[PDB]
Design a binder for this molecule. Structure first.
Ligand code: HEM
Ligand SMILES: C[As](C)(=O)[O-]
Ligand SMILES: [Ca+2]
Ligand SMILES: [Ca+2]
Ligand SMILES: [Mn+2]
Ligand SMILES: [Zn+2]
Ligand SMILES: [Zn+2]
Ligand SMILES: [Zn+2]
Ligand SMILES: [Zn+2]
Ligand SMILES: [Zn+2]
Ligand SMILES: [Zn+2]
Ligand SMILES: [Zn+2]
Ligand SMILES: [Zn+2]
Length: 319
């Protein structure tokens, strides 16, 4: 199909997304860059979608975190999310798509700006949200592995899928874990969707980048990087450590599994067969530039290897 401005897409219903794409690329993503608002928009896709429990309710990827922002943004696990919700709200008001569609569209567009990134499958047509998520549905960085895997499993994700989703932490920072050092990233390349997060979380912790007693924080290996306790444990626990290590210097697996599992997450509470595939509106991501490495001065002895079956791969260090 050909849209009014000459751009093409498989289904004509998708044409409405093109002015939305251009607006968010400039005005939410700072000119199609992989910066703060991409990272916050990607976090928003998960905090919207994981509000989904067969027992307790919540409609999953339904825009509830925007439609019922007064309730959801005050949940403790949603600390700091009000900023991206307030930034996205005027776009939803101006354009003619539902909040649930907008949150997943913005997350997919954002990720596509990141070198190494992927085009997350995107489907159009979610109805407006009809309930707020229950509290206590979003995993917290001081939750146990058992807790996190039980919560994610309740929403439909296996332990390997949790690891795959956490490739998101390769383009991510924290503002509320240690409020003395807001904006501190989880890996050394927060504007590159790469395996550095899976490498750097496996290094021996050395320091606290800000203060020393924050709930849900573990020691980091690097000044200028922050480590969550949940990531420390997921990299080391016998249920997940082998999958975690399998991501290291495995860019094709990171890409393939993150895209597939993000699509599953973006469809929680929805029926793909009732929606329209508009995946081809999402931009082509740039390539990695771009090689997996240990930080300068580090060696393989600094890796806390946690997979009994497979030795950690031999990486080189930056000079
Ligand atoms: C599995 C359990 C998870 C836990 C415990 C967790 C925890 C956290 C925490 C504590 C922060 C920092 C919030 C702040 O202080 O500002 C964060 C940020 C973030 N999370 Fe995760 N997360 C999890 C899973 C995921 C998933 C599945 C995604 C996929 C979309 C995701 C995407 C992000 C992104 C992109 C950020 C960066 C936000 C920014 O830069 O402001 N998280 N997460
Ligand atoms: C059950 As919970 C996700 O608030 O630790
Ligand atoms: Ca929701
Ligand atoms: Ca990265
Ligand atoms: Mn942030
Ligand atoms: Zn910006
Ligand atoms: Zn519009
Ligand atoms: Zn509407
Ligand atoms: Zn709770
Ligand atoms: Zn709790
Ligand atoms: Zn908890
Ligand atoms: Zn365990
Ligand atoms: Zn480096």
């Amino acid at each position: 199909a050909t849209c009014d401005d000459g751009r093409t897409t498989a289904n004509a219903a998708c044409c409405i997304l093109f002015p939305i794409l251009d607006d968010i690329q400039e005005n939410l993503f700072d000119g199609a860059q992989c910066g703060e608002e991409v990272h916050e928009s990607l976090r928003l896709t998960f905090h919207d979608a994981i509000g989904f429990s067969p027992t307790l309710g919540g409609g999953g990827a339904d825009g509830s975190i925007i439609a019922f922002d007064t309730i959801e943004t005050n949940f403790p696990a949603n600390a700091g999310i009000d900023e991206i919700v307030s930034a996205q709200k005027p776009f939803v008001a101006k354009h003619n798509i539902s909040a649930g569609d907008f949150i997943q569209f913005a997350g997919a567009v954002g990720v596509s700006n990141c070198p190494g990134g992927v085009r997350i499958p995107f489907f159009l047509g979610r109805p407006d949200a009809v309930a707020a998520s229950p509290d206590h549905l979003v995993p917290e960085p001081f939750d146990s592995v058992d807790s996190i895997l039980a919560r994610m499993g309740d929403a439909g994700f296996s332990p390997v899928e949790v690891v795959w989703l956490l490739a998101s932490h390769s383009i991510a920072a924290a503002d509320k874990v240690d409020p003395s050092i807001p904006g501190t990233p989880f890996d050394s390349t927060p504007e590159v969707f790469d395996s550095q997060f899976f490498i750097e979380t496996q290094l021996k912790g050395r320091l606290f980048p800000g203060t020393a007693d924050n709930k849900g924080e573990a020691q980091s290996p690097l000044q200028g990087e922050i480590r969550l306790q949940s990531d420390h444990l997921l990299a080391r626990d016998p249920q997940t450590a082998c999958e975690w290590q399998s991501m290291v210097n495995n860019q094709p697996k990171i890409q393939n599994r993150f895209a597939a599992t993000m699509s599953k997450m973006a469809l929680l509470g929805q029926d793909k067969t009732k929606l329209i595939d508009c995946s081809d509106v999402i931009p082509t991501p740039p390539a990695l530039v771009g090689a997996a490495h240990l930080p300068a001065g580090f060696s393989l002895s600094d890796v806390e290897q946690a997979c009994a079956a497979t030795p950690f791969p031999a990486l080189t260090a930056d000079p």
